[PDB]
Amino acid sequence: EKPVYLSVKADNSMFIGNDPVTDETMITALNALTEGKKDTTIFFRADKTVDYETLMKVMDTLHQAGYLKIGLVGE
Amino acid sequence: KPVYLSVKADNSMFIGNDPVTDETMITALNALTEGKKDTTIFFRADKTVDYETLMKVMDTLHQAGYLKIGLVG
Amino acid sequence: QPISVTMVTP
């Protein structure tokens, strides 16, 4: 059970750990990593220039899937 | 009455309808909330506001003890 | 409709 690190790059590619994901494949990836434990914390980080519209699309996808424990990581 | 912190594309920021800056946001917030750090701060931003700006605001809030954040789109 | 988050920094 490794920490879940979701990152969004400036070109809007996304990763869980080193595993590439998109908004359409992210939940399948998370569910495999967490064994469906929705109480897992999702630690989210993004490049400085990633915008609020992009962040909210990711947050909405996590939210609708029942991932309700989200930490935003700053540098 | 929920507290809404808004950040616009041009970097202007508001608590409710009242404008603030990064250096004045906490004193305004504390005056509004009676210093109750359990108040949820609702955050909304223009679509183009970037993560670096969001994190600066979140850090100012966190250092002041406001831990409960709700992001609205 | 809000998404509850925390801020995590080193």
Author numbering:
A (entry chain A): 61 to 135
B (entry chain B): 62 to 134
C (entry chain P): 55 to 64
Provide the authors' own sentences about this structure as they appear in the paper.
Gram-negative bacteria use TonB-dependent transport to take up nutrients from the external environment, employing the Ton complex to import a variety of nutrients that are either scarce or too large to cross the outer membrane unaided. The Ton complex contains an inner-membrane motor (ExbBD) that generates force, as well as nutrient-specific transport proteins on the outer membrane. These two components are coupled by TonB, which transmits the force from the inner to the outer membrane.
Two different crystal forms were obtained, both diffracting to approximately 1.4 Å; in each, the asymmetric unit comprises a 2:1 ExbD:D-box complex. Essentially identical structures are seen for the complex in two different crystal forms; in addition, these structures are highly similar to one recently published, which describes a 2:1 complex of the ExbD periplasmic domain with a 23-mer TonB peptide that includes the D-box sequence. Each ExbD monomer contains a five-stranded sheet, with two helices packed against one face of that sheet; two ExbD monomers assemble into a dimer with approximate two-fold symmetry. The two protomers contact one another via the loops connecting strand three and helix 2, imparting a V-shape to the dimer, with a deep groove between the two halves. The D-box peptide binds within this groove and, as hypothesized, assumes an extended conformation, forming a strand that is recruited to the edges of the beta sheets of both ExbD monomers. In particular, the side chains of Ile-57, Val-59, and Met-61 all point downward and are captured within hydrophobic cavities formed in the cleft between the two ExbD protomers. Met-61 lies at the C-terminal end of the D-box, and the hydrophobic pocket containing its side chain is partially formed by the side chain of Leu-132, offering an explanation for why the L132Q mutant fails to bind the D-box.
